[PDB]
Amino acid sequence: QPSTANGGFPSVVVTAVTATTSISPDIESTWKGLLAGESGIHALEDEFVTKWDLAVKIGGHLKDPVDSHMGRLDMRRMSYVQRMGKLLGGQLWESAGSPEVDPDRFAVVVGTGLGGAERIVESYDLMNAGGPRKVSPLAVQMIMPNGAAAVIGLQLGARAGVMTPVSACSSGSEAIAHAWRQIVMGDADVAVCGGVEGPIEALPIAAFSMMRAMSTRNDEPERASRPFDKDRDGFVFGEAGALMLIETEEHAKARGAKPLARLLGAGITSDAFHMVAPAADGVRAGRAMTRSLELAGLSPADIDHVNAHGTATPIGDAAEANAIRVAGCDQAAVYAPKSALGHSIGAVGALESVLTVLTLRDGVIPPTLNYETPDPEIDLDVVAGEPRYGDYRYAVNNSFGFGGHNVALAFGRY
Amino acid sequence: QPSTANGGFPSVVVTAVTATTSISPDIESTWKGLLAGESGIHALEDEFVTKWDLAVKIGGHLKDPVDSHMGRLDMRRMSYVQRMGKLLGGQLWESAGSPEVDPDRFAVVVGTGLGGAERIVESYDLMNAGGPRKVSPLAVQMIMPNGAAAVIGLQLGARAGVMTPVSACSSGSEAIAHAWRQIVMGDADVAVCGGVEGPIEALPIAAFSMMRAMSTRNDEPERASRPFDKDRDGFVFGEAGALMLIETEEHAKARGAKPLARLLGAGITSDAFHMVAPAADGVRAGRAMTRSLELAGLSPADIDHVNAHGTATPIGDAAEANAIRVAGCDQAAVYAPKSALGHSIGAVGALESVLTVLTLRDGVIPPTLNYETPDPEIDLDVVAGEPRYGDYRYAVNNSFGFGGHNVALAFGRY
Ligand SMILES: CCCCS(=O)(=O)Nc1ccc2cnn(C)c2c1
Ligand SMILES: CCCCS(=O)(=O)Nc1ccc2cnn(C)c2c1
Ligand SMILES: CCCCS(=O)(=O)Nc1ccc2cnn(C)c2c1
Ligand SMILES: CCCCS(=O)(=O)Nc1ccc2cnn(C)c2c1
Ligand code: NA
Ligand code: NA
Hints:
The PDB classes it as transferase. 2 copies of one chain form a homodimer. Chain A is α/β, with parallel strands linked by helices.
């Protein structure tokens, strides 16, 4: 049975990464800030907080707003997530040395949680105001959730598939999983993959708050996101988008690209348990980790590091602790980046996949912020206080999305 | 290099199908009507046609509306596409003999074009009216585009992955492609797959009409959808949803299920050409057909039948004729079901995949309606007049979606 370790799958490497976060528009500056213990989460200055008197008054807007890079034309022809995708797509390609690749062996897979939803309301207002002919001929291509991936595939010339998986919090990780599949099955040699997501506004806060999924620790915003802490009380929004470039090792060697890590396997399972709550027993989520190991050719003892999904909801962190144990990975050093960067839904799995790559590259795990009184019922080796330098050889990034979608990505040091 | 023909991939069969269309809620009755030359497309009786004086006054509502099967509870807890998914999911399972399968080897892949979009506007109205606490705690799970797939996976107990690809008109075909991948890569033994889509309303008509993508032949609704006809003038909406059950041949034999056809291979490519127009040269779209043949282990000469994407836009049918030629399949007998059933976007590839199965099962192709003066620049063997009974051994179903997403599915007679 084929595996990465036994050569049954081609070797696939990560050759470039890009991300915009609440800490910085530069991924290497985000990484430096994480290591320094910085948080992207602050008091929301937006007028809409006072207008609605929202329960949640904290979150992390992008440090550098996407639209500060968008002129009038882009603001009229693209939804927000398309604008963010176009921005990250060009940054990534430049960071990769702007390679000339075969378009027919080049795929794009970019997940997102929702799509161009703000253009739905706008098109509906324009039609109420002025009739059907005041809907833009660009409305369909802006609204459609595949729009961000299509923009990037068109911008970079990808003709071996342009795909958009939608699985809430796991969308950006699942995109990297399907890009890995598209390469190992032979349909592509190189792929841009990741996730983009919209900004923090009042309706998103209201919608997730009404599930009691969100922290309300407004007095101390940087202390609010507390994954695996006894005093956690839900997640915090932190805006983000992230893409990575993956390609076969032979493709990378032939064009002089230095891999940052290896992408060794990917597991996708489902809870079939509840529409928003994860299964308490963590069994299917752990099975996604196991599956990524099977495809990589690893055993649980090889896993030095787990980049947790760790949203800091009470039930989510408890389910994930069971999953890590179920997968036999609970000796691994655990990092929960949402402690610092918050939750960006459809982008966050991609962002955390980039962070996992950087952990393997630099042999260091940033501290999980606000991990001060460890939850007694959770016994994980959570990195905290200051970065932990260590000999990390293999790592799993977890993403467990609303709807019960479990994605685990197995990465290796190059 | 592995293929279905050389045993490199496990044999995968189609064991059950279900669909709701503008002709009938029963797939076998839809099939009978298609053979009899029936059209689902009629004059729209909806008040909103007069209210807005839409250019387009024709379309095919479902013969049996989804919500005539939905009580008060389902109407409050699910978006439309989730309600349609729940309806089709239960019908499919019953039609399959309600098998007991291993949940851990059971996947769901259901595409859709947009998602629970009507609940976005509703949640936003509820918040304007009564503040953030009058947004439902169910809003997130109703809005999220993965919601229909999650509903079906939860209803049927699928724990080997629940996935939602979004690729406009190719969403329902791409879902069947990823379900086939999930089985042949070893992650699952059985999968429910297909696509669901929302209903015809005024804003969707306005949005697609402003691209000049839609027929305006309101005087003769059943004559309006004219794929490959010289006098075509765009597509017609025809509501639909469709799912099929696929499983390994060994899984099917072990539980006494009679396969209706074989699912032999799937090709996914992209145009990277334009956000809504297909590439004129049809090259990448043809390459998707070729790729499905490579994975099946077939040559172009084996392809007896092509179930065309055939939307009846001027540029779309011309591009697809080039694609079929590029793929070496232009001796195949061509059917364009949108001539009778119209375009259901995210569901239509799944519906047409079911129709391809039935063509192989029954050795017959329904007539392409309204094919009366063949376009001189297109030279395809378009079935027309009355059904063509023939020895169809292998067939390709094409779906080429807005955004440049090309999916070809290779099917074989069982
Ligand atoms: C980290 C913030 C996540 C917010 S969200 O999950 O509700 N996605 C989201 C997606 C698209 C748009 C367009 N406008 N808006 C406001 C959007 C929001
Ligand atoms: C501009 C309208 C925002 C819609 S919302 O406020 O209800 N947020 C939202 C809701 C559901 C999902 C699933 N994925 N994602 C990202 C979501 C986001
Ligand atoms: C065959 C009709 C296709 C219409 S459409 O492409 O615009 N999809 C669509 C999807 C969801 C909803 C919810 N309400 N409405 C009106 C919807 C419409
Ligand atoms: C209830 C709001 C309807 C939004 S709409 O009228 O603009 N139609 C619409 C627009 C884009 C896409 C992509 N896929 N699909 C299916 C789509 C459908
Ligand atoms: Na993670
Ligand atoms: Na077709």
